[PDB]
Every structure is written in C-alpha cells, then in structure tokens.
Amino acid sequence: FVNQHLCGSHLVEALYLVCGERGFFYTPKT
Amino acid sequence: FVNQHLCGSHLVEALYLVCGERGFFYTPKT
Amino acid sequence: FVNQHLCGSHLVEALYLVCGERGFFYTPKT
Amino acid sequence: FVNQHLCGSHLVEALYLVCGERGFFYTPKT
Amino acid sequence: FVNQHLCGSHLVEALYLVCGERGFFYTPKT
Amino acid sequence: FVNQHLCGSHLVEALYLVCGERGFFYTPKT
Amino acid sequence: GIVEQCCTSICSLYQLENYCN
Amino acid sequence: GIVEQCCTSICSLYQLENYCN
Amino acid sequence: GIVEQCCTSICSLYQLENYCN
Amino acid sequence: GIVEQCCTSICSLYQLENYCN
Amino acid sequence: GIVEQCCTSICSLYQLENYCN
Amino acid sequence: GIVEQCCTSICSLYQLENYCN
Numbered sequence A, B, C, D, E, F: 001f002v003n004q005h006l007c008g009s010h011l012v013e014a015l016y017l018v019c020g021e022r023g024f025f026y027t028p029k030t
Numbered sequence G, H, I, J, K, L: 001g002i003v004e005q006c007c008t009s010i011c012s013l014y015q016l017e018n019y020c021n
C-alpha cells in the first residue's frame, strides 16, 4: 500500500478500516 | 447531549470525540 | 469527557454529535 | 454539480464544504 | 486486513487510505 | 460558494461531493 | 425540511447553499 | 454490545464514555 | 467565537453545547 | 463495479488497491 | 496540480469540478 | 506508541494492524 501521516480522527478511521471486526485500541498516552 | 444513532465508522468517530487523549477501545461483537 | 482542538469539519462533526436533533449554528466570523 | 443523497453527519459535512467561512445553520425537524 | 462494507463517501475514504500518495480513480456505475 | 484549503481526506470528500456519479481522479503526483 | 429531504430523497448543493450564514 | 446497540438502536455519549481508556 | 474557543484554543463537549439551537 | 460491490456486498483492501494510480 | 491548487493554495467548488471524469 | 509511529512519524497499513485486538 503506502505510508502517510495519520493523526486523530484520520488515524482512528484507519484503524477501523484495517481491524474492523477484530476491534482495536487507540491509546495515545501509549 | 442527545442520544445517538451510530453505525460503522461513525461510532469510532464518536468514541474519538468523547474520549480525547484518554483513547478508547473499539470492540464489536464477532 | 475531555478538551481537544476541534477545527473545521472536525469541529462541525462535533457540534452535530453534541447537538443532534436540537440543531446548531456554525458561525466562524463569530 | 450533481445531486446528493445525504444523511446524518454527511449532511453537515456537505454544508461545511458548501458554505465555507460563511458558516451555516443545521436545523433538522423535531 | 478484513473485508469491508463501504457505501458512499466511506468508499472514497478507504481508497484514500489504501492508495496514499499514488492517488486513485473513483468510478461508479452510471 | 467559497474557497477554502482542502487537503487529503477533506479534499477527497469534496471531490466526491462535487463529482458524485461522474466519478473523479485524485492524482496528487499531478 | 432540508435535513430530511437530502436523506429521504435527494438534494442539490444549490439548495444547501440556502442554509449558509 | 455498544457497537451493536448504537447502530441497531440508540446510545448516549455517557454510555460511550465507558469505553474510554 | 467557536473557532477561537474550540480550534485556536481548546474546548470541552459541554462548551460545544453553547452553539446548539 | 467496485463502487457497487463494496456497498451491496463486501470488498477487500486488496481489491481496492487495484484502483490506485 | 489538485494539491497545489486546492490544499497548498485555495480553490472554489467550481475549480474542483476540473477533476471529475 | 501509535501517535509517534503513525502521526509524528509515518506508518504502513501493516504497522496499523499492530493495534488491532
């Protein structure tokens, strides 16, 4: 595919895309 | 605040707004 | 909840979320 | 431009693009 | 990656993420 | 309408809006 | 209104523009 | 769960907040 | 206004409710 | 086509990738 | 191109139509 | 973490899969 900068919403939407039904965690504190 | 009807990526967007820097976990059934 | 920077689209989507059926005004000139 | 089928937050996104710095009011029924 | 159910603008968002700097063409029927 | 800065996703969503059924190409290399 | 018409039927950007400030 | 309830029915921001870290 | 309050600066979901109708 | 298949059925990121430039 | 016209610079909805098929 | 990997820096769709459950 590619590499881009993915931040906030944009970043979340990507995780939603990539993970979908598996689910995912967004943990910006780390 | 008002109640929400959210499907798909629109649920992840809401979680994003609601949780902020705390982040969140997205965990659908199956 | 939290506080974040909410700008343009992101800002509008938030207002949509928070206000929903009440409706809202986005008036950036002020 | 073409005609549009817009529900939910996708209507607010369109208003955002269309109105720009003028801003807009979002006023649903009930 | 998982399979996707994407309508409307959510298809263009996916294409955007998937293609990156390569860009893409969006070509619906009719 | 107006003129604003439209970048990435935001830019794509706009093209989707303006072009819809005609379809469109997003070709950032140019 | 506009909110319901764009969803249940179709609407134009020109009709949208009427809701700008 | 929450994912299904917000879509098939309705959900609140307060119920959403339970899924924050 | 909203832009200064929520974009240039930082705002809560409660401040955002100041712009509802 | 792809536009209709992702909506009416399901589609993969790998099939999406075919529409990149 | 589009990025320079609409992101780096500023573009109208009419300029955007230059990229439709 | 994710923010440093994918926002501050640059990440692939494959790196993003590191954050799925």
Ligand SMILES: [Cl-]
Pocket: none
């Ligand atoms: Cl942005």
Ligand SMILES: [Cl-]
Pocket: none
């Ligand atoms: Cl939708």
Ligand SMILES: [Zn+2]
Pocket: B010, D010, E010
């Ligand atoms: Zn949608």
Ligand SMILES: [Zn+2]
Pocket: A009, A010, C009, C010, F009, F010
């Ligand atoms: Zn954005």
